[PDB]
Design a protein around this ligand. Structure first.
Ligand SMILES: O=c1ccn([C@@H]2O[C@H](COP(=O)(O)OP(=O)(O)O[C@H]3O[C@H](CO)[C@@H](O)[C@H](O)[C@H]3O)[C@@H](O)[C@H]2O)c(=O)[nH]1
Length: 482
């Protein structure tokens, strides 16, 4: 029996024609929250993972059948609020004249010309990113546009922001659209299930799905992963990378120990269960432990593989939902206005599913399968010569980097927003391939042919005047300033 508040959310969602699966999923989360669940996973409750197989040790590729039964999906429904974006992040340029969307399509095309001509490709969009994405494909990749509605787009759900006190759905007279928020990428399972698409794919013979973030262009299908999954009989596989200094926004792997006292005579059998802990799930006042890349050295790339029939059946047996651990995000109904009421926005992360299948597992993969873009600082790295384009169109770190991406640090006051960062490279993107660390303090502007090497800091202590770096400049292990 639901409290009045929960019942009000259900009513609001029904009135707005929200899919039943999404409502059941959101409500179970609301029940948790009402009982005290904050979403936090304390350090005392988890332990490090010390042993995982490595993709580098694999060699056998899957058979044609298995490959043909694999669907590719790219997440594309988030906001780049932190980077001051207002539309799909994937529409931003990555290399001269090419956007994330450009390289994604080229990737699909390449696989359709080489691996499987009928490769099923999908994009999960939000209503905020849907139209922009469709129009881009229509003008640039018509072969994708023509089947956009039929097979490519998965529309994520929308859930109501709830008042922090009573947990009642919040109202915003000025702009009611602000009463709804995306539910996190963890919503993919729910949307796949509720729309009937998950069932449809399984009916058509699809058995696996390879999902990855829209910002990560180093991720494509590796037939060795499929063979490994087939053999080891794994239903869910998370690709994790050895954590570097640059991995601060995202989640890390961890384990807990479960005791399965199975059998007569045989004793306490210990069973390691894995789980994901997003930055937002670390108690705010214990963040340094989440930040210690030695304690938790396995960082989630969000390159996930899921066996569709199994996902479908476990959701069916569980009331038609995937009970992922809730993440309680705090904000105000009108993100911009801090005078607006405080609210909780319940979300889930796609990788949290690793805790939902008995045979779930993780695999360490090389850094080439992970080129993240969470900040403008990451965008700088991706744009610089540090990253290169492969033949199958993935963006990978240059060989000279040794799996070590440049540690970029830009003054949050001038470059956190895309408008600020865009003026920083207005005159050209500095070569960073031979650069291990570059920091920029104060207002600065790169000139053309700028080449950094070793550890380079650029200080503009002056402030009131943009320190414009000369053209052809060359900065090696130094601190350049006016
Ligand atoms: O409701 C949502 C929210 C996000 N996204 C998309 O899904 C990806 C989510 O990534 P983003 O918000 O940029 O990053 P995080 O959620 O902070 O982190 C994810 O990606 C990190 C690797 O970059 C992992 O370490 C984390 O565990 C994983 O949750 C992006 O393509 C988004 O556009 C959606 O489609 N819908």
């Amino acid at each position: 029996s639901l409290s009045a508040a929960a019942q009000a959310c259900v009513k609001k969602m029904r009135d707005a024609k929200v899919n039943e699966a999404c409502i059941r999923t959101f409500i179970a989360q609301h029940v948790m929250v009402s009982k005290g669940e904050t979403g936090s996973i304390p350090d005392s409750a988890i332990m490090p993972v010390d042993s995982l197989d490595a993709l580098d040790s694999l060699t056998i590729e899957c058979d044609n059948a298995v490959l043909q039964s694999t669907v590719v999906l790219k997440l594309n429904g988030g906001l780049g609020t932190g980077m001051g974006l207002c539309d799909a992040k994937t529409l931003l340029e990555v290399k001269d004249g090419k956007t994330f969307l450009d390289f994604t399509a080229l990737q699909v095309q390449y696989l359709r010309q080489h691996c499987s001509e009928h490769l099923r490709f999908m994009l999960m969009d939000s209503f905020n990113t849907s139209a922009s994405t469709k129009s881009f494909l229509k003008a640039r990749y018509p072969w994708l546009y023509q089947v956009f509605d039929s097979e490519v787009e998965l529309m994520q759900n929308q859930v109501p922001k709830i008042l922090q006190d009573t947990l009642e759905p919040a109202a915003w007279a000025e702009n009611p659209a602000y009463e709804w928020a995306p539910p996190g990428h963890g919503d993919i399972y729910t949307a796949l299930y509720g729309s009937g698409k998950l069932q449809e794919l399984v009916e058509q013979g699809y058995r696996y799905m390879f999902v990855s973030n829209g910002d990560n262009l180093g991720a494509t299908i590796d037939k060795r992963v499929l063979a490994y999954m087939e053999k080891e009989k794994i239903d869910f596989l998370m690709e994790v990378c050895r954590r570097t200094e640059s991995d601060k926004k995202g989640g890390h792997l961890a384990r807990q120990t479960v005791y399965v006292k199975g059998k007569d005579g045989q004793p306490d059998a210990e069973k390691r269960v894995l789980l994901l802990r997003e930055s937002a799930q670390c108690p705010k006042a214990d963040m340094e432990s989440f930040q210690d890349i030695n304690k938790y050295s396995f960082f989630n790339t969000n390159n996930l593989w899921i066996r569709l029939p199994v996902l479908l059946e476990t959701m069916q047996e569980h009331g038609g939902t995937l009970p992922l651990p809730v993440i309680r995000n705090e904000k105000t109904v009108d993100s911009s206005n801090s005078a607006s009421p405080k609210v909780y926005q319940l979300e889930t992360a796609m990788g949290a599913a690793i805790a939902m299948f008995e045979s779930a597992s993780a695999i360490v993969v090389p850094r080439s399968r992970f080129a993240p873009v969470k900040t403008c600082a990451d965008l700088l790295a991706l744009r610089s010569d540090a990253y290169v384009v492969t033949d199958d169109f993935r963006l990978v770190l240059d060989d000279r980097c040794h799996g070590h991406p440049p540690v970029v640090d830009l003054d949050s006051a001038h470059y956190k927003m895309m408008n600020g960062f865009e003026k920083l490279v207005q005159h050209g993107v500095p070569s960073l391939v031979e650069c291990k660390r570059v920091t920029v303090k104060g207002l600065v502007q790169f000139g053309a042919g700028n080449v950094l090497t070793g550890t380079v800091t650029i200080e503009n202590t002056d402030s009131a005047s943009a320190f414009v770096i000369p053209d052809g400049a060359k900065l090696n292990d130094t601190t350049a300033s006016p």
